[PDB]
Design a protein around this ligand. Structure first.
Ligand SMILES: *[C@@H]1O[C@H](CO)[C@@H](O)[C@H](O)[C@H]1NC(C)=O
Lengths: 429, 428
């Protein structure tokens, strides 16, 4: 059988109160030989990467298309599960053991991903041309729960979205790509919901001096409508995947007061009795990290942390500048992962400047301890997913992180899948 | 498992019609196989071998951090998967199970073939690589590796004491390439360190090179390790399920049959047909080296007269490539038979300067056409190529998949890339 290398998420740990030191030496990057070839030679497009780790196990998912990024009809959904194994340097590295593909059509879109014990769980949307195009065309959408385990078993189960409690407001339910979390047998994941009535209230905005009515621009570009007749709200799905008592599958609205533009995100497990953490993905005009704590009692609140030490940018400036509400959209996102259950310390993968040059950033509160290169080159990347994990028993000064990015390799106009891991400094003083 | 049934193009009768060059552009399709191999960290991938069976493929390769000369810390990868219809209804390769064996010792020089639902690899167990181990006075092991589409994996040490060498073998080494199974016997290339030097001249050329070619051919033939260690090319014969009693053995490929000691591929053509072969261009000889293998009376490599493809380096050699020298091609060529005679062939080769991977398509000694894998200044080092027909076959095409080790984004080491294509196969 396989020997297990025990690991756990850094996000379940108590925060360190000591000053976290910047690492003086350069990064020890180590192999993450996961995923597949994704068509660097033929300029294929990889979208929606999500990585998740458990106890000696990781899982990975992504969507591939030939030639363009706008061909959902002929896309292929990839799923993968693998192990943490000691290599010839005795480093714990990720390596795949089973891979699965599901070609369209319909295709699995916007899959979330988590690892529970020996099983990966993905909640996905069944679509022909992509959810927004299907909804516009008057088509319906499906949902699916996919699981696969380290034995190589694979299951896909349709979930009737009409039987999910939406307080009779939901017309369409859509999952979006990112990390999910399971607490007390309930699977939580981000998505959005087309509703009968528009959601009242102002979208979250900024008081930055932008030579305009910010709140007006914020509402206008909030992406809370798919059409004059199609309002949509951000949601968190709650699916019973093993609750102690019977629970009704439901969605809960994330009110538009809680975010700037409707977007995807990650939910980070911190323990059975601890609040989930979150990050929203910078895919619009807001160019600072969007992360913090989620609570549900009475209503869904995104308790957003005050974070300014990292800034996202595009190669070409926007008018008004990024950070000001506009129709500009960041071409390159950032992934953050909590080093503790409060998100006090964070690891990030982000572009250095101009939407290129992947770097790792390392913060405590609103202070950047250091940054290091993944690759000091003019390499653009579009999407990312990041997971950090500690061996058990832990190392004194380090944890481990793995990132997947979709990068425009060798002057390709589309992005392909690349991966890397590193020893992540975790040390006091 | 649900899969597109396939068979190797090398078992077919040669087409009696004239083969046309393809006027239309190449239809390249995804080969999303293997893993990330450290493009971001300049890892080194070596010894790639791909093999196909009936709706099944297998892949193997060796990875190292930072340099290509770190056998002590290398990792051997094995992979098996299926031929499946994608959303365009094209038959594409997709992995189902992956395996790694980190050093040390590591599996070096693995050959690879697919027998029914099981991949077979014959490998050499080594610490610092076979030549370094031999130089250091260490011994080597052999191993037979099996892994199947259900995900089962087996490795068994093979004691060289059970391999008949007519009491001449001192070390046995497998080299990376395609193997073949006929009538339950596994055949694969390798080399053998012997007690006594092999007599005879190395195969040579008569090209005017302003030198004594035969003397240079013998001197640069790589038939000696160190100063006192002669070695001979061999073909292993290992029982993997023969119906009759056989002794596992090596058979010498005499030095008259090849230019420099090197690795190669053996191509199955049917239970009752001669194997085909190719030797890998890793030295000064810069034309294809391929043809038919026979065994009745020790190994004869019946080398075809092939000149339509020529390999080149970015920096010229003095004397020029094609002339015996100590210069070595930085990029190899992979060929695959489209029939049991190797009459028609698919090739993967660099266009010029050891870069720009292209596909060539030949009949006899004529290049019908060539097509780009990538029209870019992309250096690549090693390759493996397999072509296969869906069953029932297509009228005008077959399918091919290649893996190459390419120096991506100004990396000094090469990483694993893959692609497939519809290969023109049409008459007139
Ligand atoms: C973890 O998974 C294994 C295999 O699926 C199962 O047998 C075991 O009971 C699980 N343990 C828990 C605590 O759920």
């Amino acid at each position: 059988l396989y020997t297990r290398v025990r690991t756990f998420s850094t996000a379940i740990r108590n925060p360190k109160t000591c000053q976290r030191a910047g690492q003086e030496t350069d990064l020890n990057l180590i192999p993450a030989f996961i995923g597949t070839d994704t068509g660097i030679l033929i300029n294929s497009c990889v979208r929606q990467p999500v990585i998740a780790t458990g106890d000696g196990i990781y899982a990975l998912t992504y969507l591939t298309m030939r030639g363009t990024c706008q061909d959902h009809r002929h896309a292929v959904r990839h799923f993968e599960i693998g192990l943490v194994r000691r290599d010839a340097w005795w480093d714990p590295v990720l390596t795949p053991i089973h891979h699965f593909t599901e070609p369209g059509t319909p295709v699995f879109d916007g899959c979330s991903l988590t690892v529970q014990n020996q099983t990966a769980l993905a909640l996905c949307t069944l679509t022909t041309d992509g959810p927004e195009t299907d909804i516009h065309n008057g088509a319906s959408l499906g949902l699916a729960l996919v699981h696969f385990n380290i034995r190589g078993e694979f299951s896909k189960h349709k979930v009737d979205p009409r039987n999910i409690d939406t307080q009779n407001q939901g017309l369409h339910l859509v999952t979006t790509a990112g990390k999910s979390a399971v607490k007390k047998g309930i699977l939580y994941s981000f998505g959005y919901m087309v509703t009968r009535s528009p959601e009242p209230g102002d979208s979250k905005c900024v008081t930055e001096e932008c030579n305009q009515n910010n709140q007006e621009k914020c509402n206008a570009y909030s992406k809370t409508t798919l059409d004059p007749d199609k309002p949509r709200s951000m949601i968190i799905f709650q699916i019973d995947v093993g609750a102690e008592y019977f629970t009704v599958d439901k969605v809960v609205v994330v009110p538009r007061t809680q975010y700037y533009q409707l977007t995807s995100g990650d939910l980070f497990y911190t323990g059975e009795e601890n609040d989930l953490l979150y990050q929203l993905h910078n895919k619009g005009w807001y160019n600072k990290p969007i992360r913090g704590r989620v609570t549900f009692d009475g209503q869904v609140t995104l308790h957003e942390h005050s974070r300014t030490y990292d800034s996202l940018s595009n190669q070409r400036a926007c008018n008004p500048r990024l950070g000001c509400p506009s129709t500009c959209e960041l071409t390159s996102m950032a992934s953050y992962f909590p080093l503790d259950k409060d998100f006090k310390a964070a690891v990030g993968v982000i572009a250095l400047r101009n939407g290129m040059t992947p770097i790792i950033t390392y913060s405590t509160d609103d202070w950047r301890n250091h940054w290091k290169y993944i690759k000091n080159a003019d390499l653009e990347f579009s999407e990312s997913s990041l997971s950090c994990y500690s061996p058990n028993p832990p190392l004194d000064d380090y944890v481990l992180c793995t990132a997947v990015i979709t990068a425009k390799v060798m002057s390709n106009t589309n992005p392909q899948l690349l991966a890397t891991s590193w020893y992540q400094y975790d040390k006091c003083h």
